């Protein structure tokens, strides 16, 4: 049963290959999961280092000869646009479903009863998911708990010593943008910047703009308490005549005498510019004037700012001129005959950090900005992008906190209750089917990979920290009261994940137990395996 | 027949841990490992690098190396970027940042075949390397007061200028600590302003003479001749210089002002109007008071003739970088256009003059205590442009060195010379034993990786390693009647030259690293070496 | 799959050394012959076909054009000995 | 190059053994999925039975003519495509030990199959039920077959309005002794035609008898509606003609251009003011319009409509009862308005249309279907068709025949009782017949996971003393009646899966030799 030019894996041994193809990618990707993880580093053959232990960003980057490991890759593609974290997680899931699932395969099981058995204990996974679940008040007092939300999505992507750095920075991002008395939250007001020549541990957060371009002139003030924020689209610098003309000097002094006509349409806004800083709040104290420019200012504009101490700016991106009006609040000005004191806004401290190569603008301090900005600092390029794939991941991850009330504890509690409520449950309920324990059973172990991988790349004993979180779960099952244990991977013995802070958003693992078990019952119901053009 | 297991990728190459790629990875850096060792220290070595563009050059400094080796093994560019993390910030370092992380992943080998888990190993260098950070902060000895004396200077540039140059160490402390001081201001109490640039001292070399005849001047040097007909100024101080963008010749219209020619009446026009002109726009130039003309641009036939005429020095400056420090020194401003120097636009300089240098002469720019100059000049002379040259890599890095001393309690300094080495060893086996847990095989691992740099200094001095050891550790090592261990702490390893025996004290000869490099170094190094124990699988993929 | 040189040949230790003399030795076992005043003429052709004879050790050495790197300080130190005296440049 | 002799005949069973192998997995709602590596390097996964064998390339010619049996197929009935193919690959699979191990002609079994065609098809009208076609319940709990499992399952109840509304307008119920019966013909290609309209909601689809045009009206301001619409219908344009001679107009002094501008204006009111001689309401050219006829019909009361498709108007001959004319000179009398409800100009979701709507049905609806996007509309287009292709086999003939392997079984055993008096040699071949009808049920049960050989010995067993209403469940995989668990599908699906299937037997086994070249 052949014709020319092609390659067909046909009996059971094809669903063998594609199990083992899916074993494969399960032993890679297990080492990253958890804090407790490796960082792998990718190369993308031109000599660009990418240090991340995200599942996706790792799948995206990455080629796979084989076909199972794309529909996993797919399959992680989706999580990260609905959930945005866990993606490695659901690899594990998979993996480790299709081992358990592989031994009842080799005793001549029907897939269709170990899939069916695998949507039977989904179902009782999603009423367990319910009961299981927190509800999480929401008010926004709650940063206490917002810390522990912060170290569960810092500490996998970071050394731990950068928690400490970029927890008050996360935290302090989403709740700025975050509307109050229960409204939603824009991630896109916060901007993620990075910039060169400091240390990671360096890293603050920006509460107001930054700007790339600077003041350039030696006499330009270094901070301004309080100042009167100016939005101008009008050239300071010199033009030209709007019809085709020429400048004939006859000598050096004429020659002054015209380039001075010409920009004397520029001097005439200039003027008054200058004098509406002495118009409003001139001589009080605790006040200033800033030219954000956007067009080109030449240095003889500079120079007369700087003997008023006005800071100007020029080069500024259209961008950034639209964020300014939302940060700051002060309109675009058009043209200067048109301006008034009413159109400028107000803004707090603009002080200008000065770095050789580079001049800082913060527009910080400002009365409704409604956006915020994370500037990430690094010395090289790598140090740059783990830190941003931790940003990323981390506003996310608090962000589903605020949208979605419901929350889960962490390490494992979810993992190793289900798997133990599903083995015990089945037993007393028995309403599903004799052959179907067999896709039940198989279902409950599969849930162990988790917190047997948390302590693998720990390299604690997996079965000794697992028999003491079950003498813990049977001990408060028999006290008859609700105690949530899980895996402590520093010191090794259980904990409390409500106490020690280690907390799962619910939509993280809603999707990932549902997601994970329709992927791996697809690749179980593949009897076939065609390869043509090979 | 025989089937592959590990690769599913495009028929890629893949090490997982099982393989032991960290291992593998190590042994690697161990190569580059080895190359570091022979180049720290006075009595290191230098290496021969030739280029691929047919030029042949030798230095000891090992970020040079770096830059001129073609680096894509991911560990090993680990290690090249952490070398530029330690090439910006501080001048020094270079050497002392590749030997140090690449002798922490030596011991973290050892760790490995114990069977002691990756994240276990950097968990032990994180808890040490804070119990470092905090030691050596009690460690120092010495603070650098910035008096910026000269004397204070001698100091900490002496031994910059050791193991990259020796035998020229104390010749060269004369001639960099004078120059330095030409550019640092006299203040005190003020952290504001920030000060001294790199840049402020320029470093010139002519083939001829030795060390000995090198001078220290206060002012930029420029090896372009005097275009002008006059060689050299007067000695009267303040003479006036106007600095001109636009070249010197007939001016143009600002708007079109296209030559063109039509008939022969018109070229005879064009020579004797170009004649009356320039005449004109260079008397009245002269007329201004301004003696000297630096051009940063082309100079006309006729016009270089008429300021000959009327005695105006004329140099061309065509470099716009050192037309920008010359306005640091003499205060003139540079002009767009000709024909207007403006007083307001002029500077003033004390001496400008035409010097034989190794028999060649160059007309340089000075001054005499007047119009203070923020830029100096460092005139050399050697018999070997070879040699030479790498005596201007070694200022350059001392320069950047006293860039080190600053506001971030830069002035603080520890014994160098293994000196503060072998001490810290002792004082993290002190951390060590009081740290109860799995640690304390990660920390006493951490203090014996510190005993490369001592052993280092002595393997490439000819010493016996095996005597050296001991006597740094019986030096350290004393019992006092009382918990701090007092008289001396100052016994380094010792590069003697000299016949008999034993070690020294670093205030003998003062030969010590600041605590800015030191402290930087470790936390870069260590950093660089958690790191690489991180990745335990490196996959690569079409872009 | 990764590799560290991208064919840059690079090699160390103290065999090294060793090797960087012996280059040294088979451009001093050429010049032996010339020193003196009675001593022997190199027969040189160099890549522009023309073909001198002299004894001079400056004249000889510039037209071998040694490309051994450690080799070349024997061709500094001839320019030098050229120029700080002109003669001897055998020696 | 050539393939002559029992070579050909061994070459014609694996191709076709070879396509049916790949699809004897896809039947089912427990179906295992089929992976599909393409050589540009993507994959498919999806169990489809038609999309996977599209997207596989076959060399061998009989596999080729497989696939243009299941498309041929795909246009009778909608679903139950991996039926059809595994029952004819399984008959010539069954066939093949007899035609070369037992050195059987092919001829002599050739002739077998249209005995055993015969026989099948008539077991199939014994065990079949009646249904009755006329109640509205009974059908939608028909079409629902082909309903769930789709995201139309929670408007499945309109999504048999849609169905049952199209179906009525088509059908011609006649049958009698002197015309002849048309055995209730109903064309769902033609005259079914769908149009998707994007916006609304699934719930506001309507079926409307008539026909829709998507062209506007075109002025802006015109009757919305028409009282008594009077249409005329023609093909030439109009415009201001051509002569026939070589008459150029060239104009280049001023006062020249009004002279050919009058006579423009002149002959375009002639060719309008033939068409209001009639005083119709309404003015549809085929070709396009002038902006002067525009104004000329403007102030004379009618709608006019440019650009109308030439199979349009015999749809809007029938709707309306306009006589079709070609030349503007030539409209006839017989050319009337009669039966137009209204004409409608309604704009839905910024689109215009023009419905010529009447109350009545020429045998022709329109379906208008809403959404909530074009995906949705895509959805629906395609589950509708596989709703009305449902409808369509329960109009074409009042029966029902029980599914899950229960006719496939049934006619199995009633082939084999009738073989017993077959005797002579065409016995053979005959019983191999039966043999590949149990491999339908076959497949259901591997797909389910028991024990073919107990569960199929069980379910013969069951038809031999038990009625042959006893099926396997789908879901479950235990033998079941079906009258509890109903999964009734209609004879037409049975129908053509057993003729064509013996055609195809007989097409394979008819061709001895492969030849290549031209």
């Given at each position: 049963?052949?014709?020319?030019?092609?390659?067909?894996?046909?009996?059971?041994?094809?669903?063998?290959?594609?199990?083992?193809?899916?074993?494969?990618?399960?032993?890679?990707?297990?080492?990253?999961?958890?804090?407790?993880?490796?960082?792998?580093?990718?190369?993308?053959?031109?000599?660009?280092?990418?240090?991340?232990?995200?599942?996706?960003?790792?799948?995206?980057?990455?080629?796979?000869?084989?076909?199972?490991a794309?529909?996993?890759?797919?399959?992680?593609?989706?999580?990260?646009?609905?959930?945005?974290?866990?993606?490695?997680?659901?690899?594990?899931?998979?993996?480790?479903?299709?081992?358990?699932?592989?031994?009842?395969?080799?005793?001549?099981?029907?897939?269709?009863?170990?899939?069916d058995?695998?949507?039977?204990?989904?179902?009782?996974?999603?009423?367990?998911?319910?009961?299981?679940?927190?509800?999480?008040?929401?008010?926004?007092?709650?940063?206490?708990?917002?810390?522990?939300v912060?170290?569960?999505?810092?500490?996998?992507?970071?050394?731990?010593?950068?928690?400490?750095?970029?927890?008050?920075?996360?935290?302090?991002?989403?709740?700025?943008?975050?509307?109050?008395?229960?409204?939603?939250?824009?991630?896109?007001?916060?901007?993620?910047?990075?910039?060169?020549?400091?240390?990671?541990?360096?890293?603050?957060?920006?509460?107001?703009?930054?700007?790339?371009?600077?003041?350039?002139?030696?006499?330009?003030?270094?901070?301004?308490?309080?100042?009167?924020?100016?939005?101008?689209?009008?050239?300071?610098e010199?033009?030209?005549?709007?019809?085709?003309?020429?400048?004939?000097?006859?000598?050096?002094?004429?020659?002054?005498?015209?380039a001075?006509?010409?920009?004397?349409?520029?001097?005439?806004?200039?003027?008054?510019?200058?004098?509406?800083?002495?118009?409003?709040?001139?001589?009080?104290?605790?006040?200033?004037?800033?030219?954000?420019?956007?067009?080109?200012?030449?240095?003889?504009?500079?120079?007369?700012?700087?003997?008023?101490?006005?800071?100007?700016?020029?080069?500024?991106?259209?961008?950034?001129?639209?964020?300014?009006?939302?940060?700051?609040?002060?309109?675009?000005?058009?043209?200067?005959?048109?301006l008034?004191?009413?159109?400028l806004?107000?803004?707090?401290?603009?002080?200008?950090?000065?770095?050789?190569?580079?001049?800082?603008?913060?527009?910080?301090?400002?009365?409704?900005?409604?956006?915020?900005?994370?500037?990430?600092?690094?010395?090289?390029?790598?140090?740059?992008?783990?830190?941003?794939?931790?940003?990323?991941?981390?506003?996310?991850?608090?962000?589903?906190?605020?949208?979605?009330?419901?929350?889960?504890?962490?390490?494992?509690?979810?993992?190793?209750?289900?798997?133990?409520?599903?083995?015990?449950?089945?037993?007393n309920?028995?309403?599903?089917?004799?052959?179907?324990?067999?896709?039940?059973?198989?279902?409950?172990?599969?849930?162990?990979?988790?917190?047997?991988?948390?302590?693998?790349?720990?390299?604690?004993?997996?079965?000794?920290?697992?028999?003491?979180?079950?003498?813990?779960?049977?001990?408060?099952?028999?006290?008859?009261?609700?105690?949530?244990?899980?895996?402590?991977?520093?010191?090794?013995?259980?904990?409390?994940?409500?106490?020690?802070?280690?907390?799962?958003?619910?939509?993280?693992?809603?999707?990932?137990?549902?997601?994970?078990?329709?992927?791996?019952?697809?690749?179980?119901?593949?009897?076939?395996?065609?390869?043509?053009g090979r | 027949?025989?089937?592959?297991?590990?690769?599913?990728?495009?028929?890629?190459?893949?090490?997982?841990?099982?393989?032991?790629?960290?291992?593998?990875?190590?042994?690697?850096?161990?190569?580059?490992?080895?190359?570091?060792?022979?180049s720290?220290?006075?009595?290191?070595?230098?290496?021969?690098?030739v280029?691929?563009?047919?030029?042949?050059?030798?230095?000891?400094?090992?970020?040079?190396?770096?830059?001129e080796?073609?680096?894509?093994?991911?560990?090993?560019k680990?290690?090249?970027?952490?070398?530029?993390?330690?090439?910006?910030?501080?001048?020094?370092?270079?050497?002392?940042?590749?030997?140090?992380?690449?002798?922490?992943?030596?011991?973290?080998?050892?760790?490995?075949?114990?069977?002691?888990?990756?994240?276990?190993?950097?968990?032990?260098?994180?808890?040490?390397?804070?119990?470092?950070?905090?030691?050596?902060?009690?460690?120092?000895?010495?603070?650098?007061?910035?008096?910026?004396?000269?004397?204070?200077?001698?100091?900490?540039?002496?031994?910059?200028?050791?193991?990259?140059?020796?035998?020229?160490?104390?010749?060269?402390?004369?001639?960099?600590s004078?120059?330095?001081?030409?550019?640092?201001?006299?203040?005190?109490?003020?952290?504001?302003?920030?000060?001294?640039?790199?840049?402020?001292?320029?470093?010139?070399?002519?083939?001829?003479?030795?060390?000995?005849?090198?001078?220290?001047?206060?002012?930029?040097?420029?090896?372009?001749?005097?275009?002008?007909?006059?060689?050299?100024?007067s000695?009267?101080?303040?003479?006036?210089?106007?600095?001109?963008?636009?070249?010197?010749?007939?001016?143009?219209?600002?708007?079109?002002?296209?030559?063109?020619?039509?008939?022969?009446?018109?070229?005879?026009?064009?020579?004797?109007?170009?004649?009356?002109?320039?005449?004109?726009?260079?008397?009245?130039?002269?007329?201004?008071?301004?003696?000297?003309?630096?051009?940063?641009?082309?100079?006309?036939?006729?016009?270089?003739?008429?300021?000959?005429?009327?005695?105006?020095?004329v140099?061309?400056?065509?470099?716009?970088?050192?037309?920008?420090?010359?306005?640091?020194?003499?205060?003139?401003?540079?002009?767009?256009?000709?024909?207007?120097?403006?007083?307001?636009?002029?500077?003033?300089?004390?001496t400008?003059?035409?010097?034989?240098?190794?028999?060649?002469?160059?007309?340089v720019?000075?001054?005499?205590?007047?119009?203070?100059?923020?830029?100096?000049?460092?005139?050399?002379?050697?018999?070997?442009?070879?040699?030479?040259?790498?005596?201007?890599?070694?200022?350059?890095?001392?320069?950047?060195?006293?860039?080190?001393?600053?506001?971030?309690?830069?002035?603080?300094?520890?014994?160098?010379?293994?000196?503060?080495?072998?001490?810290?060893?002792?004082?993290?086996t002190?951390?060590?034993?009081?740290?109860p847990?799995?640690?304390?095989?990660?920390?006493?691992?951490?203090?014996?990786?510190?005993?490369?740099?001592?052993?280092?200094?002595?393997?490439?001095?000819?010493?016996?390693?095996?005597?050296?050891?001991?006597?740094?550790?019986?030096?350290?090592?004393?019992?006092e009647?009382?918990?701090?261990?007092?008289?001396?702490?100052?016994?380094?390893?010792?590069?003697?030259?000299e016949?008999?025996?034993?070690?020294?004290?670093?205030?003998?000869?003062?030969?010590?690293?600041?605590?800015?490099?030191?402290?930087?170094?470790?936390?870069?190094?260590?950093?660089?070496?958690?790191?690489?124990?991180?990745?335990?699988?490196?996959?690569?993929?079409?872009? | 799959?990764?590799?560290?040189?991208?064919?840059?040949?690079?090699?160390?230790?103290?065999?090294?050394?060793?090797?960087?003399?012996?280059?040294?030795?088979?451009?001093?076992?050429?010049?032996?012959?010339?020193?003196?005043?009675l001593?022997?003429?190199?027969?040189?052709?160099?890549?522009?076909?023309?073909?001198?004879?002299?004894?001079?050790?400056?004249?000889?050495?510039?037209?071998?054009?040694?490309?051994?790197?450690?080799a070349?300080?024997?061709?500094?130190?001839?320019?030098?000995?050229?120029?700080?005296?002109?003669?001897?440049?055998?020696? | 190059?050539?393939?002559?002799?029992?070579?050909?005949?061994?070459?014609?069973?694996?191709?076709?053994?070879?396509?049916?192998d790949?699809?004897?997995?896809?039947?089912?709602?427990?179906?295992?999925?089929?992976?599909?590596?393409?050589?540009?390097?993507?994959?498919?996964?999806?169990?489809?039975?038609?999309?996977?064998?599209?997207?596989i390339?076959?060399?061998?010619?009989?596999?080729?003519?497989?696939?243009?049996?299941?498309?041929?197929?795909?246009?009778?009935?909608?679903?139950?495509?991996?039926?059809?193919?595994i029952?004819?690959?399984?008959?010539?699979?069954?066939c093949?030990?007899?035609?070369?191990?037992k050195?059987?002609?092919?001829?002599?079994?050739?002739?077998?199959?249209?005995?055993?065609?015969?026989?099948?098809?008539?077991?199939?009208?014994?065990?079949?039920?009646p249904?009755?076609?006329?109640?509205?319940?009974?059908?939608?709990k028909?079409?629902?077959?082909?309903?769930?499992?789709?995201?139309?399952?929670?408007?499945?109840?309109?999504?048999?309005?849609?169905?049952?509304?199209?179906?009525?307008?088509?059908?011609?119920?006649?049958?009698?002794?002197?015309?002849?019966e048309?055995?209730?013909?109903?064309?769902?290609?033609?005259?079914?035609?769908?149009?998707?309209?994007?916006?609304?909601?699934?719930?506001?689809?309507?079926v409307?008898?008539?026909?829709?045009?998507?062209?506007?009206?075109?002025?802006?301001?015109?009757?919305?509606?028409?009282?008594?619409?009077?249409?005329?219908?023609?093909?030439?344009?109009?415009?201001?003609?051509?002569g026939?001679?070589?008459?150029?107009?060239?104009?280049?002094?001023?006062?020249?251009?009004?002279?050919?501008?009058?006579?423009?204006?002149?002959?375009?009111?002639?060719?309008?003011?033939?068409?209001?001689?009639?005083?119709?309401?309404?003015?549809?050219?085929?070709?396009?319009?002038?902006?002067?006829?525009?104004?000329?019909?403007?102030?004379?009361?009618?709608?006019?409509?440019?650009?109308?498709?030439?199979?349009?108007?015999?749809?809007?001959?029938?709707?309306?009862?306009?006589?079709?004319?070609?030349?503007?000179?030539?409209?006839?009398?017989?050319?009337?308005?009669?039966?137009?409800?209204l004409?409608?100009?309604?704009?839905?979701?910024?689109?215009?249309?023009?419905?010529?709507?009447?109350?009545?049905?020429?045998?022709?609806?329109?379906?208008?279907?809403?959404?909530?996007?074009?995906?949705?509309?895509?959805?629906?287009?395609?589950?509708?068709?596989?709703?009305?292709?449902?409808?369509?086999?329960?109009?074409?003939?009042?029966?029902?025949?029980?599914?899950?392997?229960?006719?496939?079984?049934?006619?199995?055993?009633?082939?084999?009782?009738?073989?017993?008096?077959?005797?002579?040699?065409?016995?053979?071949?005959?019983?191999?017949?039966?043999?590949?009808?149990?491999?339908?049920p076959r497949?259901?049960?591997?797909?389910?996971?028991?024990?073919?050989?107990?569960?199929?010995?069980?379910?013969?067993?069951?038809?031999?003393?038990?009625?042959?209403?006893?099926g396997?469940?789908?879901?479950?995989?235990?033998?079941?009646?079906?009258?509890?668990?109903?999964?009734?599908?209609?004879?037409?699906?049975?129908?053509?899966?057993?003729?064509?299937?013996?055609?195809?037997?007989?097409?394979?086994?008819?061709?001895?030799?492969?030849?290549?070249?031209?």
């Open positions: 049963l052949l014709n020319p030019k092609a390659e067909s894996l046909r009996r059971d041994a094809a669903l063998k290959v594609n199990v083992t193809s899916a074993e494969g990618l399960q032993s890679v990707l297990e080492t990253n999961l958890g804090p407790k993880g490796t960082l792998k580093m990718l190369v993308d053959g031109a000599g660009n280092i990418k240090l991340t232990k995200d599942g996706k960003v790792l799948l995206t980057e990455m080629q796979i000869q084989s076909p199972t794309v529909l996993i890759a797919r399959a992680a593609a989706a999580q990260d646009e609905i959930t945005g974290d866990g993606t490695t997680t659901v690899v594990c899931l998979v993996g480790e479903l299709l081992r358990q699932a592989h031994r009842f395969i080799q005793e001549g099981v029907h897939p269709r009863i170990i899939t058995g695998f949507e039977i204990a989904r179902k009782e996974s999603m009423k367990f998911l319910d009961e299981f679940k927190i509800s999480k008040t929401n008010l926004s007092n709650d940063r206490e708990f917002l810390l522990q912060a170290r569960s999505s810092l500490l996998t992507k970071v050394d731990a010593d950068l928690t400490e750095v970029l927890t008050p920075i996360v935290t302090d991002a989403v709740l700025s943008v975050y509307d109050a008395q229960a409204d939603n939250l824009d991630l896109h007001m916060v901007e993620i910047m990075q910039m060169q020549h400091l240390s990671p541990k360096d890293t603050t957060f920006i509460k107001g703009l930054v700007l790339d371009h600077g003041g350039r002139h030696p006499d330009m003030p270094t901070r301004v308490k309080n100042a009167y924020v100016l939005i101008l689209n009008v050239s300071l010199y033009e030209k005549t709007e019809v085709n003309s020429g400048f004939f000097y006859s000598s050096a002094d004429q020659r002054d005498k015209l001075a006509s010409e920009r004397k349409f520029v001097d005439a806004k200039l003027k008054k510019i200058i004098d509406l800083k002495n118009e409003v709040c001139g001589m009080d104290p605790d006040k200033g004037f800033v030219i954000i420019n956007q067009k080109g200012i030449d240095p003889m504009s500079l120079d007369v700012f700087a003997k008023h101490n006005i800071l100007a700016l020029r080069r500024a991106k259209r961008r950034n001129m639209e964020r300014l009006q939302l940060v700051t609040g002060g309109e675009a000005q058009n043209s200067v005959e048109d008034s004191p009413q159109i806004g107000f803004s707090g401290l603009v002080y200008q950090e000065t770095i050789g190569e580079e001049k800082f603008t913060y527009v910080t301090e400002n009365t409704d900005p409604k956006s915020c900005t994370i500037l990430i600092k690094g010395s090289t390029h790598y140090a740059l992008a783990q830190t941003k794939d931790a940003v990323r991941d981390g506003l996310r991850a608090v962000a589903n906190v605020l949208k979605d009330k419901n929350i889960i504890p962490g390490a494992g509690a979810f993992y190793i209750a289900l798997s133990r409520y599903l083995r015990s449950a089945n037993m309920k028995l309403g599903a089917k004799g052959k179907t324990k067999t896709g039940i059973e198989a279902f409950a172990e599969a849930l162990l990979v988790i917190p047997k991988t948390l302590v693998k790349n720990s390299g604690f004993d997996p079965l000794d920290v697992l028999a003491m979180v079950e003498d813990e779960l049977d001990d408060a099952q028999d006290s008859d009261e609700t105690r949530y244990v899980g895996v402590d991977l520093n010191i090794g013995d259980s904990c409390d994940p409500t106490i020690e802070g280690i907390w799962d958003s619910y939509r993280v693992l809603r999707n990932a137990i549902t997601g994970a078990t329709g992927i791996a019952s697809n690749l179980l119901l593949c009897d076939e395996l065609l390869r043509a | 027949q025989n089937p592959n297991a590990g690769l599913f990728k495009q028929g890629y190459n893949s090490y997982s841990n099982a393989d032991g790629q960290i291992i593998k990875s190590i042994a690697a850096i161990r190569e580059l490992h080895q190359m570091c060792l022979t720290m220290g006075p009595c290191g070595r230098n290496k021969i690098i280029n691929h563009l047919g030029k042949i050059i030798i230095t000891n400094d090992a970020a040079t190396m770096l830059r080796l073609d680096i894509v093994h991911p560990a090993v680990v290690l090249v970027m952490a070398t530029e993390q330690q090439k910006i910030d501080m001048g020094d370092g270079t050497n002392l940042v590749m030997i140090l992380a690449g002798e922490l992943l030596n011991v973290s080998e050892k760790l490995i075949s114990m069977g002691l888990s990756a994240v276990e190993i950097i968990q032990g260098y994180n808890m040490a390397r804070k119990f470092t950070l905090k030691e050596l902060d009690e460690m120092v000895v010495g603070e650098i007061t910035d008096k910026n004396d000269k004397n204070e200077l001698l100091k900490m540039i002496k031994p910059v200028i050791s193991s990259k140059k020796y035998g020229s160490e104390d010749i060269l402390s004369e001639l960099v004078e120059a330095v001081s030409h550019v640092l201001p006299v203040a005190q109490q003020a952290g504001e302003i920030p000060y001294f640039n790199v840049d402020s001292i320029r470093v010139v070399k002519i083939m001829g003479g030795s060390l000995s005849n090198s001078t220290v001047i206060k002012g930029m040097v420029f090896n372009r001749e005097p275009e002008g007909h006059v060689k050299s100024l000695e009267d101080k303040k003479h006036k210089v106007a600095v001109f963008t636009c070249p010197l010749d007939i001016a143009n219209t600002e708007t079109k002002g296209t030559v063109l020619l039509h008939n022969a009446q018109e070229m005879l026009d064009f020579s004797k109007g170009e004649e009356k002109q320039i005449d004109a726009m260079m008397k009245e130039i002269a007329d201004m008071g301004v003696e000297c003309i630096v051009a940063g641009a082309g100079v006309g036939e006729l016009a270089l003739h008429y300021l000959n005429r009327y005695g105006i020095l140099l061309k400056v065509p470099s716009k970088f050192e037309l920008r420090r010359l306005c640091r020194v003499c205060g003139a401003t540079p002009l767009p256009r000709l024909g207007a120097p403006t007083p307001e636009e002029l500077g003033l300089v004390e400008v003059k035409t010097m034989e240098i190794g028999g060649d002469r160059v007309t720019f000075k001054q005499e205590q007047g119009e203070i100059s923020r830029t100096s000049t460092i005139i050399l002379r050697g018999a070997t442009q070879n040699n030479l040259d790498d005596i201007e890599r070694a200022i350059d890095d001392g320069v950047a060195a006293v860039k080190g001393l600053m506001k971030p309690s830069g002035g603080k300094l520890l014994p160098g010379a293994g000196a503060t080495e072998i001490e810290l060893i002792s004082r993290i002190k951390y060590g034993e009081r740290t847990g799995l640690l304390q095989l990660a920390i006493k691992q951490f203090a014996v990786a510190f005993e490369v740099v001592p052993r280092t200094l002595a393997e490439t001095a000819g010493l016996d390693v095996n005597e050296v050891l001991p006597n740094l550790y019986a030096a350290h090592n004393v019992t009647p009382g918990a701090v261990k007092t008289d001396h702490l100052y016994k380094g390893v010792d590069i003697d030259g016949s008999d025996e034993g070690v020294k004290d670093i205030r003998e000869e003062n030969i010590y690293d600041m605590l800015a490099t030191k402290k930087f170094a470790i936390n870069v190094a260590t950093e660089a070496a958690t790191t690489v124990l991180s990745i335990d699988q490196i996959i690569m993929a079409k872009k | 799959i990764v590799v560290l040189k991208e064919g840059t040949d690079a090699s160390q230790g103290k065999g090294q050394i060793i090797s960087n003399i012996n280059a040294c030795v088979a451009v001093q076992e050429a010049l032996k012959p010339t020193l003196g005043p001593g022997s003429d190199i027969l040189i052709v160099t890549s522009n076909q023309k073909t001198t004879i002299s004894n001079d050790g400056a004249t000889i050495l510039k037209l071998l054009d040694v490309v051994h790197p450690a070349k300080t024997l061709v500094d130190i001839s320019r030098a000995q050229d120029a700080e005296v002109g003669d001897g440049t055998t020696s | 190059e050539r393939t002559t002799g029992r070579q050909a005949q061994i070459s014609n069973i694996t191709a076709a053994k070879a396509v049916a790949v699809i004897r997995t896809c039947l089912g709602p427990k179906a295992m999925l089929k992976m599909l590596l393409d050589p540009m390097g993507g994959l498919v996964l999806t169990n489809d039975g038609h999309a996977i064998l599209r997207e390339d076959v060399a061998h010619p009989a596999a080729k003519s497989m696939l243009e049996l299941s498309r041929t197929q795909d246009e009778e009935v909608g679903d139950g495509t991996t039926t059809v193919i029952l004819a690959g399984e008959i010539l699979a069954q093949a030990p007899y035609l070369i191990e050195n059987i002609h092919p001829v002599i079994i050739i002739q077998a199959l249209k005995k055993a065609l015969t026989d099948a098809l008539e077991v199939i009208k014994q065990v079949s039920k249904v009755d076609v006329e109640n509205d319940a009974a059908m939608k028909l079409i629902q077959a082909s309903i769930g499992t789709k995201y139309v399952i929670h408007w499945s109840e309109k999504m048999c309005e849609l169905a049952l509304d199209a179906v009525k307008t088509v059908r011609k119920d006649l049958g009698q002794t002197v015309e002849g048309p055995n209730f013909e109903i064309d769902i290609k033609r005259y079914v035609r769908v149009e998707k309209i994007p916006g609304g909601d699934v719930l506001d689809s309507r409307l008898k008539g026909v829709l045009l998507n062209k506007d009206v075109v002025h802006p301001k015109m009757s919305r509606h028409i009282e008594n619409p009077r249409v005329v219908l023609l093909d030439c344009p109009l415009e201001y003609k051509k026939e001679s070589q008459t150029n107009i060239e104009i280049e002094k001023e006062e020249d251009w009004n002279r050919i501008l009058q006579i423009e204006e002149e002959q375009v009111q002639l060719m309008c003011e033939q068409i209001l001689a009639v005083r119709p309401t309404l003015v549809i050219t085929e070709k396009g319009v002038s902006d002067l006829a525009q104004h000329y019909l403007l102030k004379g009361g009618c709608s006019v409509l440019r650009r109308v498709k030439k199979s349009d108007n015999n749809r809007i001959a029938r709707v309306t009862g306009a006589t079709i004319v070609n030349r503007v000179e030539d409209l006839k009398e017989s050319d009337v308005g009669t039966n137009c409800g004409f409608k100009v309604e704009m839905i979701g910024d689109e215009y249309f023009s419905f010529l709507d009447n109350c009545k049905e020429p045998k022709a609806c329109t379906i208008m279907l809403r959404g909530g996007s074009k995906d949705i509309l895509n959805e629906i287009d395609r589950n509708l068709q596989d709703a009305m292709a449902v409808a369509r086999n329960v109009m074409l003939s009042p029966s029902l025949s029980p599914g899950g392997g229960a006719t496939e079984m049934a006619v199995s055993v009633k082939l084999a009782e009738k073989a017993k008096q077959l005797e002579g040699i065409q016995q053979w071949p005959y019983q191999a017949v039966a043999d590949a009808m149990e491999c339908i497949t259901l049960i591997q797909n389910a996971g028991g024990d073919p050989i107990r569960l199929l010995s069980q379910l013969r067993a069951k038809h031999a003393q038990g009625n042959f209403t006893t396997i469940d789908g879901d479950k995989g235990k033998i079941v009646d079906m009258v509890s668990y109903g999964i009734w599908e209609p004879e037409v699906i049975k129908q053509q899966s057993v003729k064509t299937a013996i055609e195809s037997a007989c097409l394979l086994l008819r061709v001895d030799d492969i030849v290549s070249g031209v």
